[PDB]
Amino acid sequence: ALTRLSQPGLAFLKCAFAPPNFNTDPGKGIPDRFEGKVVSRKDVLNQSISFTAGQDTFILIAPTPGVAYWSASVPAGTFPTSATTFNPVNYPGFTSMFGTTSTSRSDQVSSFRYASMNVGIYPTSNLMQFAGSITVWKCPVKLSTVQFPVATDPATSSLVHTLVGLDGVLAVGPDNFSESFIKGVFSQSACNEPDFEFNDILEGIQTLPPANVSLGSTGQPFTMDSGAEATSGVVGWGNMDTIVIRVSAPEGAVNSAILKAWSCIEYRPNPNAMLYQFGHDSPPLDEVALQEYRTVARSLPVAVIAAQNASMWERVKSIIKSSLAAASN
Amino acid sequence: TRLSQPGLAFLKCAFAPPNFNTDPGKGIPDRFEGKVVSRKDVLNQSISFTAGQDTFILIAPTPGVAYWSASVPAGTFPTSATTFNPVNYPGFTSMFGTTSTSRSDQVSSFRYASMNVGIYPTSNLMQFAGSITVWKCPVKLSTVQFPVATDPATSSLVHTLVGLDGVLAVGPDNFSESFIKGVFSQSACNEPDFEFNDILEGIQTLPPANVSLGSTGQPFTMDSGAEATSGVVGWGNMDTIVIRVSAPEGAVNSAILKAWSCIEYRPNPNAMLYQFGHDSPPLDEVALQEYRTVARSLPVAVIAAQNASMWERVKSIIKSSLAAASNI
Amino acid sequence: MAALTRLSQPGLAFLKCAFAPPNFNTDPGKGIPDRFEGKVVSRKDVLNQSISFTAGQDTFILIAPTPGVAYWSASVPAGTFPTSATTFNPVNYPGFTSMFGTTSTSRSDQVSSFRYASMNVGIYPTSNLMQFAGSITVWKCPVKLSTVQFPVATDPATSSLVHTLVGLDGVLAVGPDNFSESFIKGVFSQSACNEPDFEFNDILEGIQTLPPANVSLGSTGQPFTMDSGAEATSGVVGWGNMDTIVIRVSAPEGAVNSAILKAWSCIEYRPNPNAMLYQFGHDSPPLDEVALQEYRTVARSLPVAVIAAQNASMWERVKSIIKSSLAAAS
Amino acid sequence: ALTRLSQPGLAFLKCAFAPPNFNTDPGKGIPDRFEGKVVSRKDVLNQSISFTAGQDTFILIAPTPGVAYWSASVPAGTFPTSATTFNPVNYPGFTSMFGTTSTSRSDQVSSFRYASMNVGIYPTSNLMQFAGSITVWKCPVKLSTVQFPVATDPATSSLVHTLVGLDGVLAVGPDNFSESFIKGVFSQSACNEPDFEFNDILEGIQTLPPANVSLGSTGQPFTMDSGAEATSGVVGWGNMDTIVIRVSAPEGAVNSAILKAWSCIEYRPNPNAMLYQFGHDSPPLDEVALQEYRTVARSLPVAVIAAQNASMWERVKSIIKSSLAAASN
Amino acid sequence: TRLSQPGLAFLKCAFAPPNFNTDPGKGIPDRFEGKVVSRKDVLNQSISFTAGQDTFILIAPTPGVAYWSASVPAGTFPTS
Amino acid sequence: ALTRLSQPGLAFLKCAFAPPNFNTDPGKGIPDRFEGKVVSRKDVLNQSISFTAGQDTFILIAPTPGVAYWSASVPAGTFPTSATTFNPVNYPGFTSMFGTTSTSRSDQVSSFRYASMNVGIYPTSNLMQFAGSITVWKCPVKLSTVQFPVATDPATSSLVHTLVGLDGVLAVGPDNFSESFIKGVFSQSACNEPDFEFNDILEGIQTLPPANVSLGSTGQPFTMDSGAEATSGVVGWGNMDTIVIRVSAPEGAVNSAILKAWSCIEYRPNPNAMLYQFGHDSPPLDEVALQEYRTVARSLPVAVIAAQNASMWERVKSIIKSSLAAASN
RNA sequence: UUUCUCUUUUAUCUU
RNA sequence: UUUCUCUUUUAUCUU
RNA sequence: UUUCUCUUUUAUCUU
RNA sequence: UUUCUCUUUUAUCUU
Ligand SMILES: [Ca+2]
Ligand SMILES: [Ca+2]
Ligand SMILES: [Ca+2]
Ligand SMILES: [Ca+2]
Ligand SMILES: [Ca+2]
Ligand SMILES: [Ca+2]
Ligand SMILES: [Cl-]
């Protein structure tokens, strides 16, 4: 049954829903209509992380290139406020691709498009000290713009990047996974568009709201700060929903874990880049894989405990064969 | 092959005439199948047209706002001296707040499936006079880049509507008929696919505050008013319908106007909207090609009487096109 | 053949305007065989220009998907590439103004949005065998039109956002995937949609230079500058979804390099009801699965560029790649 | 496959797109509905020609009977102006058919209709001295009329022959062939009507605008002067587009060549003419040939280099068999 | 046999009623296949007819001119 | 016969002596004892170049990572003098690997080792204007050090990088290839050590002699200037002899060409680099390939004309089979 | 671009 | 205008 | 790490 | 200029 899929079409589905803990081929690309030259980037992060007691730590798997996630900590039982600021954590070699200045992101590559975005939280802590829960839901966060006037001389109108849908982080979504901390968790996001459009690399973005822009004007409920332009930054915004994770650590609880992040991204490389050497045409269209991708995604749970992560690939193959069969009637 | 339930519903909300208890359907049978909330916006507006005036109505793919209306002296078109004002769909505020920075509080993005409009004359036959003329415009929301002599010197970039110049003349492809005969017309996706558009914050006027209409290139103005009552939350990929009601001097032109919109929004987990969301309908190749074929085959607009047999006209175009394909 | 019979009439025309020389193809073709079937106006822009290259200078040309401008050129010192000090200047296709007016704010008067189908270019040397010298190198860059965000110390202090050309840097190095041959052998090369689908792009208002007026090249990241000149003669009306063809013509000193330059552009526009253009419109041709798949395949199968001599073999060369892949399916 | 064509139907297609350098049968006529008596005239010119340096020489293959082409020279980088005058070059024996006075053209024949109109430019010059290019495009030039008043006594209204579509010569058509001079060129024109209508022979035409007629009144962008009525003249205007050729010779360039012109024309002969002796009925209708003619014509390039001229006939047969085959489905 | 795309479009521009987003079609499906430009001319004219007058309108095959209008006293026809 | 070589062992020999004009696999690595993780970098340059008349232009294919070659021009009939300075030309994406400051070269990679170094010069110029010759020889240039005292306070002793064997560029080596310019040339260099040792990446090197160092102290006959630290630099010195090319262009000669450069390099990647994603173990030892490598190298000519470049691979296979056969006795 | 064998040599899919 | 053979004798189409 | 088939799917070597 | 078939397609010579 899984023989109706082209080689890449299958590979594609594995990067998408499978956890390549093994050094599996990073990617073969996306089996969609596009077949121009791209570079399959397999971003993976392994961050050991300790959650502070009495704090409800928030993590955002936000489809920003090179930066695995963003996290902020808030007093237990509460959510981010205007007073909150999220700080990015990068994937290995951020600078090796986007440079060290807010105006050199498009040096290596010009555009991109995500294929997968997975995350897992495995628990370090012993069974006597842990406590608390891990809650997950996904937000349709897009990167729009805000228009407002400014009393300068002459008076003028401003336009800047603003994040819409952030207000979704201020409450636990109805469609969510919630369970004991110790059980860990695995979850992934998918393309929030009817197709895989290429997005441009964005220059100069270090903070949202921008420098000199008040938060109130933006609409955004809180702030995104990538920090020094030489260490991190916002190079773009993919068409993937953002995964939200709330790890609430009660008082005196010793909750530690290891967090892993996966990201299959097709970048359009520049000839002057060395990166270009590893370019290859995108895999040619695989109608079946593209239809299964959608079906599988819609079928899977918001998230699952860490243990069920291994059977994840197996869980996926059954949904496919079950879909390919129920469609042979 | 045949259409799915959602794929058929999709075609009904799309071309279905008003009255049919049309089902919003599960939404768009297009490759996307993520979480969405289907809203079927409907407006019923009693309205009287100023005699000796040529009133211009615009159905444009802005969420929450049915149409935009401006009026000018009979025989003329909008001028730089003209400003169009929104009329809201019921509950605009309950969706996009009361601040120009509250639009994306409930939903983050959207995509139009249909955008219909109908005008049913209520005038008694002698009293009424005039015509109704319709044509559609490919109005897109772009941007304009101009420098500004501030200190230090800077360059501005702001929203600007392109293709508005098409409203200053009656498009060759148009429907023209006696006012009394009413009218029904619909718009459709002006893109090959139904991609999602983002919700836009801060937009109240175009040209925006502190920008001269000269800077934008726009032929006239768009004013939504108090940010507490209305505003421009986004611009969808649908051609904009233009309606000219020509009321001569001493003409009593009264009528009802209905606005239909089928929109798929991406709900924010925090919104009270979310509990009504489901997943966008899985791809229905048939529907997606029927949609396109029907759209192209349908007239710009029709009189109100032909609207009733409109659905039947659609099933007619469905079988004829489907029959040729089945034969091979 | 069975392949040729499967293709819808517009679908065939589409492929020709895309991969084949204009002289071979009288037709533009109706338009793009994709799902979109709304009202459009197919224009096939063709520039013919006798050009002579500056001896002792490398001239760089860019076939960049901006409507109604054929290409952008600039010459630099032999052996070097564009620098911050360099500025590229457009050459228009015939009747630029008749399409996009004469002021930087009247670009969207005739049409509102657009989408490219094909974008070819060819150089036919006209020098005798006692005067020609030098090389013609060609590669393509994925140049997209994005934006840059940066704060400004005005009163009050504000944050700017302007247009920036991303991936322009690729023009400063000849990528491993390239065509390079003696000048005399001329060259032919086309570009194709760098997106999975042909979506429409808006017409851009007020753009005359990039970086724009009052902006330092430094704050944009762009390696060099783009200047369309007087708003009354040219300008940047938009940026299509096609990779940009880069061309480096090196002329040694004392060399007479003359040639003819041709440029094709199959573009589908969204006509404004008021435009005098509109009366020539028609509906975009309906979807042709086959043609769209052949397009992709052929596109990826063709070489970066080819010498002018085997350019005629091109149409026939393509007809081969179509029947070779349409062989695997059945 | 090429056996579905009648003998003449094939012949017809050869005269049309083939270069009978060989003394091939001149013609068998046109396989259209008409079958009355005609005379198949195979006009052929062999003119050695040297292009002056710094001049962009313009040649017009204009479907005027007996006159191969018309040429004028303009300063390089420029086009004909109101100040330009084109002078005809005749095909052998012009006078032997149209006489020696502007009012004796219809003496031999009364009407006509073109079948083919081909032209080729082969290059004399060595590879060290040549330079420049040959550009080609075709213009829909028809022969209409202009109506204007004249202040005579009594005042009256004039009506005279005027050429419409000449403005097409003032710019290089978008559909054109352009290439290095040395590569030569071959191109042909075809019937610009849905059928082969007969045109009358025109008496008294020596210049356009006529004698006593100002150029401005005509609309014509430049002038056509056939010269002495005893040596040349305009005897008619066929339903063929006119082939335009711009040979631009840079400064110091030594560009010479040999130009050849072909023209298959069916003339209606007069009994009192000796010419009549060689009359024969037009070939009876050959639906296939008439449909192929159209297909082939539409398929062929504007023009091709001289070298590809030999394979021209072969190029044509493949288009036919390819059309006859793709139509057997 | 059945009609071609252009041949069908041809029949639509020919008899198609106004409103149908009629496609100019590629033009005339007639033996000729040379270069042409298809133009679909459309005029929308608001007009009032003089009372006691018999207004005469002429649609005539002149490019660029929709119609020709003259008016005469009711019950009569054009005169020199 | 060529089946006694492992897959990589063969590949290895192709990168070494074959011109992958085709996008052949860049590399599989070096079949030597080492099997740790490396990244096979296939550096390739395509530089159009015009040689000035009356000048004897000198090009050095010097096994410095990221920089294809270095060239200087001297008055015809002469060689570099103390007054000469060579300027590097980079391979695409220099900065994308070694950064933009003289102290960030070891950011991406830590060490390296060359496998191949090939160069070819193909001629643009016509046969009437060219003149002159291309001369080639190879120099055993190593990167050593110089020790000298400096009268500072307190007085101290300096030690800096100095290039030994540069004096080999001041005369045409006895073992050389010399031939008419128009004939072009192809030549390659090989490992100048009994094994493939890894060399470290060198920080801070922009010029040799260094800044503040007089040329006389160094011993070096001329100067090496990589220019702005943000555009180029000397990141290391491989164990390959340097290829020297002297293109002497007489007065009035119009000599142009296209120069190509190949370089197979195994770099030891850093985990924090994205570059690392494309790492793989070095191919395991292939005694045969390593012995053939040596034999082939020793056999081949200094250089050959451009035309014989295509048969180069074939020329190589025959030497191998001829060696594998003459060794079966 | 015309053609197969052979070993390759990876890479999945299945027991 | 009623009919074939025969050589003609050109003329293409195909290997 | 225990085992084969199968199609893969690239990749060379040979005619 | 190297070679035949095939239909041609005219054109005579003969019943
Ligand atoms: Ca908000
Ligand atoms: Ca899209
Ligand atoms: Ca405008
Ligand atoms: Ca940059
Ligand atoms: Ca005129
Ligand atoms: Ca020394
Ligand atoms: Cl020109």
Side-chain angles (χ1 to χ4, degrees), chain C residues 130 132 134-135 137 177 180 248, chain F residues 23 46-48 124 126 129:
Chain C
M130 167 199 79
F132 86 82
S135 65
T137 313
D177 279 34
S180 195
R248 172 185 62 188
Chain F
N23 294 243
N46 186 63
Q47 190 52 48
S48 67
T124 36
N126 67 80
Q129 312 286 259

Side-chain angles (χ1 to χ4, degrees), chain C residues 130-212:
Chain C
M130 167 199 79
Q131 68 184 201
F132 86 82
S135 65
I136 298 180
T137 313
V138 181
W139 62 107
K140 300 168 187 169
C141 289
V143 184
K144 312 274 197 173
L145 174 67
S146 210
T147 70
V148 67
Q149 160 191 302
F150 62 82
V152 183
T154 58
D155 193 11
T158 55
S159 210
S160 295
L161 184 58
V162 290
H163 295 298
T164 303
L165 285 170
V166 170
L168 222 41
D169 307 272
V171 191
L172 315 203
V174 188
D177 279 34
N178 69 64
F179 165 83
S180 195
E181 199 59 57
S182 174
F183 173 77
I184 199 61
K185 300 192 181 183
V187 63
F188 177 75
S189 170
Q190 70 285 0
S191 177
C193 187
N194 50 43
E195 217 69 32
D197 61 329
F198 298 85
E199 53 171 0
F200 279 102
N201 283 346
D202 312 311
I203 284 288
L204 302 179
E205 289 291 19
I207 301 166
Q208 290 298 138
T209 63
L210 291 176

Side-chain angles (χ1 to χ4, degrees), chain B residues 170 172-174 176 244 295-301 313, chain E residues 2 12 18-23 40-44 46:
Chain B
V170 188
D173 285 302
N174 68 60
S176 295
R244 175 182 79 177
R296 188 192 70 260
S297 298
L298 288 171
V300 188
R313 312 186 49 174
Chain E
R2 289 184 172 291
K12 286 184 177 180
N19 64 34
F20 288 99
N21 303 325
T22 75
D23 202 3
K40 176 63 174 311
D41 292 302
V42 183
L43 175 73
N44 269 71
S46 307

Side-chain angles (χ1 to χ4, degrees), chain D residues 163 165-167 218-221:
Chain D
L163 288 169
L166 278 178
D167 305 275
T218 45
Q220 306 183 203

Side-chain angles (χ1 to χ4, degrees), chain F residues 259-316:
Chain F
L259 179 153
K260 283 183 160 288
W262 297 277
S263 283
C264 240
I265 311 175
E266 270 195 2
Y267 292 90
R268 301 284 285 84
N270 286 308
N272 62 329
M274 70 82 58
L275 188 74
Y276 193 96
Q277 185 192 305
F278 313 115
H280 64 275
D281 289 345
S282 156
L285 157 62
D286 186 313
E287 192 53 50
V288 187
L290 300 182
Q291 291 194 13
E292 290 315 302
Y293 178 81
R294 299 292 166 170
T295 299
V296 172
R298 187 197 73 247
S299 301
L300 294 173
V302 183
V304 304
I305 59 193
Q308 301 176 327
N309 183 336
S311 76
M312 185 57 141
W313 176 231
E314 299 299 341
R315 168 190 259 90
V316 181

Side-chain angles (χ1 to χ4, degrees), chain A residues 32-37 102-104 106-107 109-111 113 145 150-153 156 158-161 195-213 268-273 276-277 281-282 284-285, chain C residues 35 139-161 164-177 193-197 199 218-221 243 287 289 292-293 296-297 300:
Chain A
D32 73 329
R33 307 184 162 289
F34 182 70
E35 285 180 62
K37 187 182 292 300
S102 60
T103 57
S104 52
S106 78
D107 280 331
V109 291
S110 61
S111 36
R113 63 177 192 178
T145 58
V150 291
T152 52
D153 188 64
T156 62
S158 295
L159 185 50
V160 294
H161 294 300
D195 60 354
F196 301 77
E197 209 61 34
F198 267 107
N199 294 63
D200 322 310
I201 288 292
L202 304 169
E203 299 276 44
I205 312 181
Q206 292 303 135
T207 61
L208 287 183
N212 293 181
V213 184
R268 301 284 285 84
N270 286 308
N272 62 329
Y276 193 96
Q277 185 192 305
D281 289 345
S282 156
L285 157 62
Chain C
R35 296 168 173 294
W139 62 107
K140 300 168 187 169
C141 289
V143 184
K144 312 274 197 173
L145 174 67
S146 210
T147 70
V148 67
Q149 160 191 302
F150 62 82
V152 183
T154 58
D155 193 11
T158 55
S159 210
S160 295
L161 184 58
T164 303
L165 285 170
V166 170
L168 222 41
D169 307 272
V171 191
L172 315 203
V174 188
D177 279 34
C193 187
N194 50 43
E195 217 69 32
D197 61 329
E199 53 171 0
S219 48
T220 62
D243 281 351
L287 163 59
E289 262 315 308
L292 302 185
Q293 292 185 185
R296 294 296 166 172
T297 300
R300 173 187 55 68

Side-chain angles (χ1 to χ4, degrees), chain D residues 7-287:
Chain D
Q7 205 69 71
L10 184 68
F12 168 67
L13 293 177
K14 279 180 180 177
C15 205
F17 313 88
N21 63 347
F22 47 88
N23 294 243
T24 191
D25 202 17
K28 293 184 180 301
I30 300 182
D32 73 329
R33 307 184 162 289
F34 182 70
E35 285 180 62
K37 187 182 292 300
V38 304
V39 177
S40 297
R41 177 63 177 156
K42 178 62 170 177
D43 279 307
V44 298
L45 170 78
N46 186 63
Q47 190 52 48
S48 67
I49 165 178
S50 313
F51 305 77
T52 58
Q55 292 291 303
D56 270 23
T57 308
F58 285 71
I59 301 170
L60 310 173
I61 318 303
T64 60
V67 179
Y69 70 89
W70 305 69
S71 71
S73 39
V74 159
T78 72
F79 292 71
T81 74
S82 48
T84 300
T85 302
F86 282 89
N87 292 128
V89 175
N90 308 336
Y91 269 123
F94 174 91
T95 41
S96 61
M97 268 209 74
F98 307 110
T100 50
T101 76
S102 60
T103 57
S104 52
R105 312 310 192 190
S106 78
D107 280 331
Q108 291 288 68
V109 291
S110 61
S111 36
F112 68 92
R113 63 177 192 178
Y114 276 72
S116 73
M117 198 167 83
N118 309 283
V119 62
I121 291 168
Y122 308 95
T124 36
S125 49
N126 67 80
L127 319 179
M128 307 295 96
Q129 312 286 259
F130 92 84
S133 76
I134 301 179
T135 314
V136 181
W137 64 100
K138 304 164 182 169
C139 292
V141 190
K142 311 299 192 73
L143 174 73
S144 199
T145 58
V146 66
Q147 155 181 296
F148 60 69
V150 291
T152 52
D153 188 64
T156 62
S157 199
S158 295
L159 185 50
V160 294
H161 294 300
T162 182
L163 288 169
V164 302
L166 278 178
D167 305 275
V169 184
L170 314 176
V172 186
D175 287 308
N176 70 61
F177 159 81
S178 64
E179 176 83 58
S180 176
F181 171 78
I182 202 65
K183 292 209 163 186
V185 65
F186 177 73
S187 183
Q188 63 283 84
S189 170
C191 183
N192 60 36
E193 293 285 339
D195 60 354
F196 301 77
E197 209 61 34
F198 267 107
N199 294 63
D200 322 310
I201 288 292
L202 304 169
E203 299 276 44
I205 312 181
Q206 292 303 135
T207 61
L208 287 183
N212 293 181
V213 184
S214 58
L215 175 53
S217 64
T218 45
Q220 306 183 203
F222 48 71
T223 308
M224 296 301 292
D225 172 39
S226 59
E229 63 168 359
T231 57
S232 185
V234 178
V235 305
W237 193 270
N239 313 310
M240 305 274 270
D241 282 10
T242 302
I243 309 174
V244 185
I245 312 162
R246 180 192 67 182
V247 184
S248 54
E251 212 62 60
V254 175
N255 298 338
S256 178
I258 300 172
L259 179 153
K260 283 183 160 288
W262 297 277
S263 283
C264 240
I265 311 175
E266 269 195 2
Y267 292 90
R268 301 284 285 84
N270 286 308
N272 62 329
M274 70 82 58
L275 188 74
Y276 193 96
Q277 185 192 305
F278 313 115
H280 64 275
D281 289 345
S282 156
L285 157 62
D286 186 313
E287 192 53 50

